[PDB]
């Protein structure tokens, strides 16, 4: 019996990782469980096109054809029509006109300014597929949904003649997350990092950028007495998002002191070194890191297998 504690910031992928364990070692998401996620996939898409809409307002963006103005109005009229997984085709057509319009797209490339779900461009492009009345979410659709994680989430599976209990803490509040109870002991920690988060944009109240806050969280998690012989596994996740982001936005955004160039590999190893250098601990406590795209069931599968061989080597 192995104990995996799943720790990360917000929107870091932990529910995506749990959903991946249920896919990979459990039987996976049956059609019924997909059908439940119908309404999630819907309201994710709606809140997301709404998000970009409202942010056209504050970033001062216009609609490529002003014909879209009333389309905007109609959105908010039928925003709740999809309460019960019923996307009327009127609602569909509105979301398509809006997403296809230029100015909406301009605000969306600005994206990093107004904060919007990572799986937005996904559903929004594949909207034709989704808008069928009889559409069933693909497994990748369920993996793309953001449901926000309430209390303490648990998962039991078996792998390689070994029982595993995984716990997503979530908690939705950085101090409610305290739960040092679970902290005591624990086979292995899985700290998850939203790479794509470097270039995000400081809030008014926000002291440091998201990336730095996560680094502090990791520094306290690793350099903890409870996790001395805990195996520490860092997922530098959303490598796909981050890989896309380096082209348009420099890593100088997050770390200013970075004199290396804005390429995938340099920036990725520099973030890696940034996190790994927080460990003041022994040479017996060497952090194990992997770069990861948690929505890729195959990528996860392979990573997690190398992870288990690590955890085994400790016992
Ligand atoms: N496109 C993409 N989305 C990801 C990746 N990893 C996680 N996500 C998405 O990130 C969003 C936040 O993940 P979530 O499961 O809520 O993480 P949590 O905050 O730790 O519970 C979800 O919509 C996931 O679908 C990735 O590598 N690529």
UniProtKB/Swiss-Prot annotation:
Changing residue 8 to R: In ARCND1; likely pathogenic. Residues 3-16 are annotated as: G1 motif. Transmembrane segments: none annotated. (Microbial infection) Deamidated at Gln-172 by Photorhabdus asymbiotica toxin PAU_02230, blocking GTP hydrolysis of heterotrimeric GNAQ or GNA11 and G-alphai (GNAI1, GNAI2 or GNAI3) proteins, thereby activating RhoA. Residues 292-297 are annotated as: G5 motif. Residues 164-173 are annotated as: G3 motif. GTP binds at residues 10-16, 118-119, 143-149, 169, 171, 237-238, 240-241, 293-295. It comes from the Eukaryota. GDP binds at residues 11-16, 119, 143-146, 237-238, 240, 293-294. This is Guanine nucleotide-binding protein G(i) subunit alpha-3. The lineage of its organism: Eukaryota, Metazoa, Chordata, Craniata, Vertebrata. The gene is GNAI3.
């Amino acid at each position: 019996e192995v104990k995996l504690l799943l720790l990360g910031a917000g929107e870091s992928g932990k529910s995506t990782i749990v959903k991946q364990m249920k896919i990979i070692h459990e039987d996976g998401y049956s059609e019924d469980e997909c059908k439940q996620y119908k309404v999630v996939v819907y309201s994710n898409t709606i809140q997301s096109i709404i998000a970009i809409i409202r942010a056209m307002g504050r970033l001062k963006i216009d609609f490529g054809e002003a014909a879209r103005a009333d389309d905007a109005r109609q959105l908010f009229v039928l925003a709740g029509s999809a309460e019960e997984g019923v996307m009327t085709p009127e609602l569909a057509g509105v979301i398509k006109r809006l997403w296809r319009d230029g100015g909406v797209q301009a605000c969306f490339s600005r994206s990093r300014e107004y904060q919007l779900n990572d799986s937005a461009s996904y559903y929004l492009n594949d909207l034709d597929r989704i808008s069928q009345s009889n559409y069933i979410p693909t497994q990748q659709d369920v993996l793309r949904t953001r449901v926000k994680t309430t209390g303490i989430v648990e998962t039991h599976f078996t792998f390689k003649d070994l029982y595993f209990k995984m716990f997503d803490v979530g908690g939705q509040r950085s101090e409610r997350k305290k739960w040092i109870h679970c902290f005591e002991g624990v086979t292995a920690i899985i700290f998850c990092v939203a790479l794509s988060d470097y270039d995000l944009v400081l809030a008014e109240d926000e002291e440091m950028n998201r990336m730095h806050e996560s680094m502090k969280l990791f520094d306290s998690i690793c350099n903890n007495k409870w996790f001395t012989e805990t195996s520490i596994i860092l997922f530098l996740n959303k490598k796909d998002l981050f890989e896309e982001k380096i082209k348009r936005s420099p890593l100088t955004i997050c770390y200013p002191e970075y004199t290396g160039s804005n390429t995938y590999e340099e920036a990725a190893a520099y973030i890696q070194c940034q996190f790994e250098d927080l460990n003041r601990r022994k040479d017996t406590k060497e952090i194990y890191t992997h770069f990861t795209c948690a929505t890729d069931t195959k990528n996860v599968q392979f990573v997690f297998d190398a992870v288990t061989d690590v955890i085994i080597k400790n016992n």
